[PDB]
Amino acid sequence: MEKEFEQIDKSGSWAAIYQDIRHEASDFPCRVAKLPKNKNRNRYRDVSPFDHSRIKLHQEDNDYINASLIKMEEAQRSYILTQGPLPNTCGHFWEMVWEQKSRGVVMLNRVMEKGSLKCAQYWPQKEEKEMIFEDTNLKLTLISEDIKSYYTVRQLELENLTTQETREILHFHYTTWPDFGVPESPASFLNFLFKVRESGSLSPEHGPVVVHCSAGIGRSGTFCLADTCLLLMDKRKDPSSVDIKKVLLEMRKFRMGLIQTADQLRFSYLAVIEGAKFIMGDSSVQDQWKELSHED
Numbered sequence: 375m376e377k378e379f380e381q382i383d384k385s386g387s388w389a390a391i392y393q394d395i396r397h398e399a400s401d402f403p404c405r406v407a408k409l410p411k412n413k414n415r416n417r418y419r420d421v422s423p424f425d426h427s428r429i430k431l432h433q434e435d436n437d438y439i440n441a442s443l444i445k446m447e448e449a450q451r452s453y454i455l456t457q458g459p460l461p462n463t464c465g466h467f468w469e470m471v472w473e474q475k476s477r478g479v480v481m482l483n484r485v486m487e488k489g490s491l492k493c494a495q496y497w498p499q500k501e502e503k504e505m506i507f508e509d510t511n512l513k514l515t516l517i518s519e520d521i522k523s524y525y526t527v528r529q530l531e532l533e534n535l536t537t538q539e540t541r542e543i544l545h546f547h548y549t550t551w552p553d554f555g556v557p558e559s560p561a562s563f564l565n566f567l568f569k570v571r572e573s574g575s576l577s578p579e580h581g582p583v584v585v586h587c588s589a590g591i592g593r594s595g596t597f598c599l600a601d602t603c604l605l606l607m608d609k610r611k612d613p614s615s616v617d618i619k620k621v622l623l624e625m626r627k628f629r630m631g632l633i634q635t636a637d638q639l640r641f642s643y644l645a646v647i648e649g650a651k652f653i654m655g656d657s658s659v660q661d662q663w664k665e666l667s668h669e670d
């Protein structure tokens with residue numbers, strides 16, 4: 375894929391490759407999302423989950439939430455991309471984390487961006503101010519947090535008040551990824567992704583990681599495109615066969631608009647390429663990425 379990256383760069387055709395991809399993307403029914411009773415469960419009117427992969431809450435009332443299950447079969451990993459929750463869908467958000475047995479949550483956005491609210495404050499900021507979602511009978515408590523330069527990892531306790539059960543949810547918040555933008559560098563992004571991988575949150579023994587930004591397609595799609603590609607070129611007989619454009623389209627069969635700009639697509643090539651060093655054998659690389667990320 376590196377000779378392709380060069381070819382495209384030298385040609386100045388990212389907008390074209392990206393456009394081809396948008397044009398080719400899957401189009402599936404989003405009936406439930408469009409139901410009139412779910413208008414206030416959707417942050418954006420042009421971003422809905424496909425009925426076939428949408429996540430269904432386990433409640434008879436209304437099992438709708440703007441979230442999609444991205445099941446990458448060959449890569450053997452599943453992600454749930456959802457929108458930044460709305461004031462009225464925080465309980466729903468956590469009901470899904472519980473019901474889906476998720477271990478981690480990856481936030482790649484800020485609550486406020488461009489002076490506009492892009493996501494509700496769905497997690498407690500102070501351990502003393504825990505959150506109780508009366509509608510889904512859940513309790514959320516902040517136990518600790520490790521603040522780095524461009525991201526914060528939080529340790530939350532999600533308690534299902536109905537079953538009396540407790541679960542620790544790791545929160546991975548990338549705080550310096552601008553909307554429609556790209557990480558500050560391949561190393562800062564890779565350092566973050568691998569931070570998420572080491573915790574175990576992406577392991578098959580836990581439910582699918584919940585990944586979201588504001589719409590749950592741009593930055594989320596990017597985070598996932600890179601993770602899935604790195605998974606494929608580690609289990610594939612020939613690492614060179616992995617086609618990022620083709621892997622992206624596959625992902626778009628599960629949720630629309632993954633990757634929102636040509637520059638995020640390009641960045642995705644840079645991340646995978648760089649990340650390939652680790653995949654191909656060299657342990658050192660990661661330690662260098664961390665140094666470069668300047669998390670301190």
Ligand SMILES: NC(=O)[C@H](Cc1ccc([C@@H]2CC(=O)NS2(=O)=O)cc1)NC(=O)[C@H](Cc1ccccc1)NC(=O)c1ccccc1
Nearest residue numbers: 417418419420421553554555587588589590591592593634
């Ligand atoms: N296209 C857009 O920019 C947004 C969707 C959107 C929002 C954020 C992103 C972000 C890009 C990124 O890098 N990461 S991300 O969180 O996916 C990517 C796409 N959509 C809207 O803003 C819609 C546009 C629209 C308006 C009318 C009919 C159909 C589409 N406005 C609204 O949805 C809206 C909502 C409430 C009040 C008024 C308008």
